[PDB]
């Protein structure tokens, strides 16, 4: 089965560039009844929009509140408020209005292109939360198949162990620009039932150990696989002699001052040879304008193989499933369009840019470049290089105006994207009550998975760090002032600082 990550690990890897937020904090249990008091009070402040909005705006005014802090703050907020998604959303929307109003003297086409603010990161976390269903239901499967096809196609030819260059690839920079003879090899491998694994002559023994591990650990998530450097490989040449096969040993040869890694052909391993796997820089080499034709068609073959898989994926991402309409996407796109009308922005391009800078570029591009955010699978610099080419094509598909390989396909992708944004305009509008019932359901669903207490405590450190600034901000806000929020804020600080000393001291 497709090795999906649990929802918590998905959130963990996308929200933060964490184990603390998953398990209950092993803080002292004698001051714990006192701690829950301080966190409860602070929750009350956080759950009041007149505090939170002022709180965020105040932190962002600081010249020493770094970009990562604004992002760490945003994610902590998403986790803490995860049980109150409706309230979280409305906070985000107000904060988004403030962002748009602040950019009223700038080009509207530059909106939401980066993530240098608390709200921008909040948007990414909202999209992520709301698209996890899409992944599990429709997009996750073709994406995983594409990954499998990418890996399969590259393994057809040789791969350099050091440079990572191969015969097949989508990236012009990773082409094995050398012409080296390489014949396939089948190996009857054991693992203390015997199985058969295909490799190449030029494959190093690390690479072979890896290719073997993939066969024996097929129906197993990657985090449970042993490693190449953890296993040994043993050849059975005859009945009186066996040979442990390693990348480097006594048989290793030096050429031109450099030492070649031991290949499958270095030991001259025959076809169908019995092998046994068991548990236990720039000084060494392996295989070392206009692009020539002999390399060009190696790029074409790889693209041609995956083309079916790739089309399926983009279609999955850029189309509506009738069984389950994208309520969230529809809700935010209605918000963007409504926000544009109020300000005299009718230019179709800017709207297209807004939508694009909200969902496809915010969530999907990083998803295409980071499959580990979704699956418990392996990351290699080579597969990454192919994903970069693919993701760039997706990026180009979203625009309006090494980039030669997919040049023919992009115009059709653009029409799909335009056909996709039209679909969302064409689906029946969802009311606020309908969308909130959805957000309520999702909050109920994932209620006991995140440790909100740890999240609150981390947020508090920002509040403590800027204790006098928030106080001033709260008193400079007549609404916050009238409802005694600066008093309630100081009550939290006082109570928290008494509790933290009781625990750690």
Numbering used by the authors: 1345 to 1361, 1389 to 1563, 1568 to 1655, 1670 to 1677, 1697 to 1809, 1820 to 1923
The authors write:
GIPC1 (GAIP interacting protein, C-terminus 1) and its two paralogs GIPC2 and GIPC3 are universal adaptor proteins that bind and regulate vesicular trafficking of many transmembrane proteins. GIPCs contribute to the endocytosis process by tethering the cargo proteins on endocytic vesicles to the motor protein myosin VI. GIPCs contain a central PDZ (PSD-95, Dlg and ZO-1) domain that mediates the interaction with the C-terminal PDZ-binding motif (PBM) in cargo proteins.
The overall structure of apo-PlexinD1cyto are similar to other plexincyto structures reported previously. The two GAP-homology regions (C1 and C2) fold together to form the GAP domain. The activation segment in the PlexinD1cyto structure appears partially open, although it was crystallized in the monomeric state.
